[PDB]
A paper describes a structure:
The hyperpolarization-activated cyclic nucleotide-gated (HCN) channels play a crucial role in regulating neuronal excitability. The HCN1 subtype is notably distinguished by its primary localization in both the central and peripheral nervous systems. Overall, the structures form a symmetric homotetramer, each subunit comprises six alpha-helical transmembrane domains, with two forming the pore (S5-S6) and four forming the voltage sensor domain (S1-S4). The cytoplasmic domain contains an N-terminal conserved HCN domain (HCND) and a C-terminal cyclic nucleotide-binding domain, which is connected to transmembrane helix S6 through a helical C-linker domain.
Here, we present the cryo-electron microscopy structure of human HCN1 channel in complex with inhibitor ivabradine, the drug on the market that acts on HCN channels. Reconstructions of HCN1 in the ivabradine bound states were carried out to an overall resolution of 3.23 Å. The overall architecture of ivabradine-bound HCN1 closely resembles the previously characterized apo state, with an RMSD of 0.5 Å. A nonprotein density is observed, surrounded by the S1, S4, and the unique HCND at the interface between the lipid bilayer and cytoplasmic side, a feature not present in any of the previous HCN1 and HCN4 structures. Specifically, the side chain of F143 on S1 forms π-stacking interactions with the methoxyphenyl ring of ivabradine. Additionally, N107 and F109 on the HCND, D140 on S1, W281, F285, and Y289 on S4 exhibit hydrophobic and van der Waals interactions with ivabradine. Notably, mutations such as D140A and F143A led to a dramatic decrease in ivabradine potency. In the ivabradine binding site, the residues F143, W281, and F285 exhibit slight inward conformational changes compared to apo HCN1, likely induced by ivabradine binding. In the ivabradine-bound state, W281 is oriented toward S1, nestled within a hydrophobic cavity at the interface of S4, S1, and the HCND. The inhibitor acts like a wedge, engendering hydrophobic interactions with W281, thus preventing the conformational change of the S4 helix and maintaining the HCN1 channel in a closed conformation.
Numbering used by the authors:
A (entry chain C), B (entry chain D), C (entry chain A), D (entry chain B): 97 to 241, 252 to 579
The structure:
């Protein structure tokens, strides 16, 4: 199964990235050119290793800053097992990254193990990854073995293990893009969550820095730790007030107790103020983009109607006409912005036929002429039907006018006013204007909408074009 | 009338959601399939019950947090009548929700009482609604009947009645969507008001939490209540300073008196800081969307002219030509962005005829050829007329050029320069270029705009097409 | 001249609102129907009275709050002359508003003095305007003439003169709309300035309220004035610290000295915090809209190229082809988003001819065939020319291919590779492909761009269409 | 080389601004009309002088405010060499600006030395530039030579050298526009960086002002310097706390130590609060524009699909059909918004042919009819091919239907269901519907997609049109 895990298995993502099985099976074979040493970027092992690393790299980036800053002994047996075990998992990841193909913009997944992948990692992120993976602090401690300066350096050297933020950022970005293909995550929701994670991590690290700079200076008499008398407090009361102090600078509220007296404090407060304000300005920006994208369809309709109001304003249309047009837009588009012609053009011939049959088949089927027609012909006619809304009192057809189009009534109560009978109120499902299909003369009756009336109009020219394609009918 | 209230009555919303009466009367009959136990989501009873619940659920969500936090006795007769009466109204609502059809995306309103509605509520919000409706606090008090721990639990158990926020949020969203169909509320104004309501409610609850966590700990010596000496103050001075403290953290101003000394305070301040900053970031985001949507039409014109400036920049047009084009855009579009062809195409044949007659009928009626024509023919010609603005000094028609279009003058003072008379200044309402309609030769006079001149041009080809449809004229 | 001032004079705004002189002179006559009692909303008297009122209403809204709050005696002779003189100017304005026509959306300017204007003001803003104009404080003082309560009421009654904010807001909105027609003020710059004015005015009034509520309570012992010992300080040190306190709550910085001890202070601080945060959220929103509209043209190009990158990504085009396409877009559109077809269609026939002659006349004039042609024919051909950019190495024409288009070279160095001579490098202004105009055969030479090459192509079909219109040439 | 440096050399910017070499060489000659006294705005000397000035003007605008405010003696030999040397470089720049051509909107680069450039600088920025370049402070000191008032004026007079901000702003804007042509810098990234530079500079200057106003008043007893006892502290502890105080007002956090007691402090704090809040509101605005422009392509796709959802909602399509359409959009556009017709129309004939050959040549080449065709004919057919995605189960071709289009299969497994054989599963690269090219009859087999199936369809009409152009084939 080792070859199977290292190879991109047939999944919804694979079949949507590479075209189809025969394409996925071609890529699986391309990996089999190198042996036991090539992992595909989309491989499930890369998926499983990346899910193991991301849990480990959030835990390390939350436990490691607290362990150096708020605990005096980091050479104790539990902290050496934790830092060696994490460093081993991270060092394996560096070896695996040398043998994992890299997705490439405008190309395939670089896969040649000797130079395509090994010489791209070395020229790119190998150093940041080497410094984070290696236990520099333990190497210095072993080489060096006046101890208090040694303990102060080890604490600074063990924060080179926070460069794993490079891998957490890179791995999250790689798998978020794979998930965007696999699912349709809203871009704004994915982006705001990456910042909320980055803001929480930076607030944790700023809280730790606010106690590390005072700790690495032996708690100077003007440091907040000494001034608030929290040098001897428990790690919880030291961490909670350091996070409180760092969150307060970030959301820019105020301070822990008082304004910074010392120069290490005045500068570490200013770094946490600049980091905090930039993160909040970005959160207000990400929040604005999420809020704009939630109401995009309703905002786009309002921008469409406002332009209709500007047309009416330019032509100075009377207020009565301006309300007839507002009532038409409310009852024609129903608050919905869509382009039927563009949306229908994008759809394939089978999906267009299904949408047209659901919308128009019932009404056309009732008409006697289309009842006995071949389903192929009816489907051609159904495409021709155009949707038209007539407001109350409007004359859909006027007596004595040339008849260029017949109407199928989807909804609304119309009324056929004539000279002989003068009383015929057609309702939902009824058809009018039928005679105007092969006579090419003049309409004998006038139909007036008596309520809004949503109708489907087939123009005599369009009927002829579909009729030309099917000669018998 | 019980059947009538439970059934969706013929209203502007019903006739705009379901197509028309015969459709509304069909739905009213669909409800009559189940008896006395089915309420339509659009029913007026659902409207009236939801208006009763929303007033009750704002009152309960404002009175209930204050009653538990700032008043020691909640077993007094007035607070038991208030909490039993509200719990009865809320419990009825749970029974009614089991028998109310649920609007469904992509479908009808689920209406079958036995499983379509009952088994969807149980699998969805029944629990949150059961916990909020039941008086858990009173059930615990009755079962349990060392009392101080009992009073502290009852206070936490009586805040499970704040889960009614689920119903206030769901009911407000259901009826705001019904109102959006019933009226055209701006999406941004509706969304900002839902946040201002949610921000005010969260600020009220954070103020109460800031006194409840200290109260449930017997006012510990480091709590703000004890430090500011407000343990024995009136409920007004305790509530006002707790709201002041919670609003200050939310708008991120500062603190009530000093930075939090205790760990319950440092953590409850940090929760109110994170809740407050996220609510304000969302208010700055909702404010940006309201401000962008108020000036959408003016912003869209500026983006249209900026593109004209970019065309002029690419072609490096001289500054004099760039000002002639700016003056044309000011006097043609008048600061208004609209697409006449798209806006006219959307309108039905009667509304298009009305807009065209108001804009063009007066001018065409003056012309002698169109004066005696059948109103049907004139309406066809009026559609052909195209609107054209000629700047001062422009030559609308040049002598000796082939004549392909005649001009009707809506506004502006033109002037007919010829060789014989050489002085004829036509003004508003005048027509020129008329001879170029059936001669198909060359123009004998040159007309120069002497002011901006808004004219309507009928091309000889368009005159022929309308003339082809009406043979006699 | 009294009739002339009350009548809308022929100005750039009048001639752009009403169509032209004969339309403006028609409106001037419509005003002359009522006598000495009708002022047109666009009248210059309305302009001059509104410029007098706006200076007076900013001065009153800045001097009047300070005079009541920071000065004990407002019955002194200088403050009675100032408040009577301002009240007289404001009372005249109420009389004039009864006789000024009101611009109406979807209509003309309501002008009938007896009911169209008088009964619309009474039903609209007469009350707010009556309360602001009348000296209620002086009427109460005269009627009432235990004095300390009288002085406290008069101070509250004299703040009903701050309702003139209604007129400043209405007059600024009326004249900003008139200026938008008169000039093209950016909407965002006009809107941000209205808020900066409203924010400065609300900050001034919040500063005064922070000292008025303590003053109207005889400086209670817990008020900030008494706690900071500023009861007996000069009006400058009392106003400056009250503005500092109100600006600090508004920009949400902190407090003047300490968090509010009293309940009048805790509530007046909370009102100034909610007013301040809403104004700042709106300033961040107006700033976002100004910043987005400054770079609209550059942002729109980036959105256009990003879509080209998405087309290339979907088709998985090789990285080399992706760079050829990026270089084409840089050298064809030059970072400019414009639609030549839409921008040209909007322009009138004279402006289109001028832009086409400047862009193309020099190059076409050099060609021998078009040199002797009638300027009418050349102008028709110049419209047909299409702009095309060929990248270095591209083959503009290939030997042996059917010739459907000739090329005029605007810029770039091409090269004619043939079999006989095989060396001819054409440069700026040169024409190639000329033989392919009346032969309808095959090209004998292949022209390869040797640098980018911006050329104008005239298709043989387009040459024939212009040639069809002019038979002799 | 002096003439060469002053002349616009042939560079990527020059060849993209002026059309090509022959155009650049024409401009180089236009400069040679004036002698040794005309520098082109795009000249490399202007580039090199502007890069020298910008380093010098950032250094002066950072060192000069600190030198006046935090150092008592500015007449010392090192500060006189620094201020004379910088003033000499700045005075040369004023002389050079008199002889450098100015880029002009809508025109060429003003180049005539006597009046085009000299009389435009004098009427524009000569004064601000003269006041900044001249050492006013030293001129006053020499003329004047009771000394403490002289030292206080000199400190105010030496801040007229901060008007060089005019040149830093103008030079940065000129060279950022030149770089935008030279490279495609994102507008949002360039604009946010100009603000981060302006915010850092204003925060530096506000920190210095907070100590200069107290210094110029002899450290009054209520000034923060005296109250925090920092009058005698080192320049580092005075500057660091003044910057801390000014950054705190700007990001609106709080204060250095306490709220301002004196009136110089209450007003200098209010100026730094208004300057700081306006800069942060602009940073939140620039951050919103950068964040919106990073995800423009993904946001635009979501707005396109939301409109498809609104079309489906208006027609009330069943939920099953709504999921077939969502799956089509995911597998047709693949999350990418692009307009193939618009993107292809913009590209030149060679780039369109290359994109079409890469996308379609392999599949068409396999077909036997197109295998022996002339490459010219195949390229014409390849343009006709249209891309179509058929979902699983869809019938691409139905037996007995008239055949109007043949299909080339790019990806997916189809299946040819017939009556005779009834089993033929075509895969990637296969072609079906071929017989429907010259028969004009009815299809004998029905092909059903058995997986998504991305195919290229050539319509019989389009095949005929390309076949009409090439008669032999
Ligand atoms: C961060 O601040 C700096 C910014 C910059 C540079 C240095 C900086 O450090 C002070 C480098 C530089 O000069 N260029 C880039 C050098 C690359 N070349 C290709 C562009 C430059 C060289 C040249 C020459 C030109 O004359 C034709 C010209 O057109 C005006 C433009 C240019 C501008 C950016
Ligand atoms: C809800 C719909 C619109 C889909 C949106 C998907 C969202 C909710 C998902 C997709 C990927 C997710 C992210 C994946 C990984 C991380 C990194 C971690 O350190 C913090 C959480 C964070 C940032 C997740 C937050 C939630 C997330 C952004
Ligand atoms: C003014 C025009 C554009 C129409 C806009 C309608 C606005 C003003 C209306 C429509 C529905 C209304 C909301 C309905 C119910 C609630 C919940 C309540 O707890 C707070 C107020 C709030 C949130 C209302 C605020 C105002 C509101 C949003
Ligand atoms: C600079 C270009 C884009 C044109 C923009 C015009 C701007 C600068 C002008 C037009 C009208 C002006 C406003 C007119 C009247 C007032 C009310 C006053 O109490 C404060 C200033 C304020 C709000 C002005 C600010 C500047 C303003 C908004
Ligand atoms: C990264 C891609 C998108 C290109 C963007 C270019 C950006 C990073 C470059 C282009 C020009 C640059 C600016 C040029 C000059 C200055 C003035 C200086 O006082 C502060 C930095 C600042 C403001 C630079 C910041 C970075 C900058 C804005």
């Amino acid at each position: 199964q080792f070859t199977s895990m290292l190879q991109p298995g047939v999944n919804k993502f694979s079949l949507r990235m590479f075209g189809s099985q025969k394409a996925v099976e071609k890529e699986q074979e391309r990996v089999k050119t190198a042996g036991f040493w090539i992992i595909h970027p989309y491989s499930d092992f890369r998926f499983y290793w990346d899910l193991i690393m991301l849990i480990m790299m959030v835990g390390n980036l939350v436990i490691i800053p607290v362990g150096i800053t708020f605990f005096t002994e980091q050479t104790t047996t539990p902290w050496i097992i934790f830092n060696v075990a994490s460093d081993t998992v991270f060092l394996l990841d560096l070896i695996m990254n040398f043998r994992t193909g890299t997705v490439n913009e405008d190309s395939s997944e670089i896969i040649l193990d000797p130079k395509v992948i090994k010489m791209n990692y070395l020229k790119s992120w190998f150093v940041v990854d080497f410094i984070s993976s290696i236990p520099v602090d333990y190497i210095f401690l072993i080489v060096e073995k006046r101890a208090l300066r040694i303990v102060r350096f080890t604490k600074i050297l063990s924060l080179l293990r926070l460069l794993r933020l490079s891998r957490l950022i890179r791995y999250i970005h790689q798998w978020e893009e794979i998930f965007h293909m696999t699912y349709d995550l809203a871009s704004a929701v994915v982006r705001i969550f990456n910042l909320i994670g980055m803001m929480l991590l930076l607030c944790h690290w700023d809280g730790c820095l606010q106690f590390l700079v005072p700790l690495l200076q032996d708690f100077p008499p003007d440091c907040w730790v000494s001034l608030n008398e929290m040098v001897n407090d428990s790690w919880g009361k030291q961490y909670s007030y350091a996070l409180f102090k760092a969150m307060s600078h970030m959301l820019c509220i105020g301070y822990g107790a008082q304004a910074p007296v010392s120069m290490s404090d005045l500068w570490i407060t200013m770094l946490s103020m600049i980091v905090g304000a930039t993160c909040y300005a970005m959160f207000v920006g990400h929040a604005t983009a999420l809020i704009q994208s939630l109401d995009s369809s309703r905002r786009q309709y309002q921008e469409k109607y406002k332009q209709v109001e500007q047309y009416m304003s330019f032509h100075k249309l009377p207020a009565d006409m301006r309300q007839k047009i507002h009532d038409y837009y409310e009852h024609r588009y129903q608050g919905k912005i869509f382009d039927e012609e563009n949306i229908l053009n994008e759809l394939n011939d089978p999906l267009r036929e299904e949408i047209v049959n659901f919308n128009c088949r019932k009404l056309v089927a009732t008409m006697p002429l289309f009842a006995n027609a071949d389903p192929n012909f009816v489907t051609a006619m159904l495409s021709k039907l155009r949707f038209e809304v007539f407001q109350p009192g409007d004359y859909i057809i006027r007596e004595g006018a040339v008849g260029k189009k017949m109407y199928f009534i989807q909804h609304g109560v119309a009324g056929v006013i004539t000279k002989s009978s003068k009383e015929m109120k057609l309702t939902d499902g009824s058809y009018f204007g039928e005679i105007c299909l092969l006579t090419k003369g003049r309409r004998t009756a006038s139909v007036r909408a008596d309520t809004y009336c949503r109708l489907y109009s087939l123009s005599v020219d369009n009927f002829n074009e579909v009729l030309e394609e099917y000669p018998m009918m």
